[PDB]
Symmetry: D2
Subunit: 116 residues, 4 copies
């Protein structure tokens, strides 16, 4: 599903950026001591999102085992990051926005996974 | 610099890394891959440096702006070199044309921030 | 175990570098057209090991499904990369070297996953 | 040449050691009760780690070598390792993780500067 693959890559790039924006904004909060789990998972999500986009971008010598394993990791980490950001969404707009982006990427990863 | 100029350059770096990864893969799949090895290698470098630059820019506050400048200059240099090599193959390979344009837009975005800092 | 954690992070960092080196050596071979899956899989492995090292560095024990997900992906891609390198190891010392690095990272990720 | 390839190997090794030192320091700072006073350290630790792994990767590649690219990357790595070392050194009195990170940054900075001088 070439449109599902392209959408997944796009969501990974959007999500990486939303996650790094969220990490930076949490680091700048006066209440940063209460946001350290959010910062950590934001960073985890950004790192896994860019790696996922990269693996999905390659078609030479395609191996479904690797593609599925990376997609699963990406879905799991986007879910964790979305849940953690959701805990602080009322207090912080950057967290609400990051959660949205994480849910969107999780869904695109699951859709792609189901289709492969 | 502005938050909107940062965000533009961070997006460009993320997109340029992806574009360079896609181009390197498309070149690897060509039957003429042996002719494309410098393109692939420079794609790989540009993706790595764009990846680092996106992350560094994300944490930019304005303090220790010499870090931001140094990383921007590395990104601009490799994007320009990657574009130059891709352009050598762009008449033959549309994938290289596409990559070259991604490299030019990231190069300009980095330069625009360098002027601002 | 923070010392096991550190050992696995080091494995991931060194495996990413090993894979990058191997991909470059394959790229420079006259027989590069026969080595394209090796190169691609080397790139995937480097990308996933790079993300894994970073995610492991931030592991706290909380939300450890994030850590499990990247270790599973990392073990899977390191196994695949080692398989493709091992196929070429008789002709190319650089592939032999890379397979050994992939196998050690594979094993370290598996061990850490068993401990969690 | 041979001396260059050996200095590149030494710098790659320092980059890998430095990346891990830096991520260990970021993690430790995030865990400190005084995390609010360590946010610049955490930011620069991460910048240094990201640039170090990229630099090791670029230096690993010999196909289609371009000295100008490699120099620009090395300059970035030297500059961030200097910044990271300086910021960690501010806190080294209070935090061993910061002292250890500063030492790794200094050693990586030196190895990058060696290649900038010798290539």
């Amino acid at each position: 599903d070439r449109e599902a693959m392209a959408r997944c890559i796009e969501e990974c790039l959007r999500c990486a950026q939303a996650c790094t924006a969220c990490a930076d904004a949490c680091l700048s909060e006066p209440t940063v001591a209460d946001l350290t789990k959010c910062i950590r998972t934001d960073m985890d999500c950004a790192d896994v999102c860019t790696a996922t986009a990269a693996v999905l971008s390659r078609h030479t010598g395609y191996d479904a085992n690797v593609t599925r394993a990376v997609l699963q990791a990406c879905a799991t980490v986007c879910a964790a990051c979305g849940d953690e950001c959701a805990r602080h969404a009322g207090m912080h707009e950057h967290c609400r926005v990051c959660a949205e982006a994480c849910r969107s990427c999780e869904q695109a990863c699951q859709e792609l996974l189901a289709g492969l």
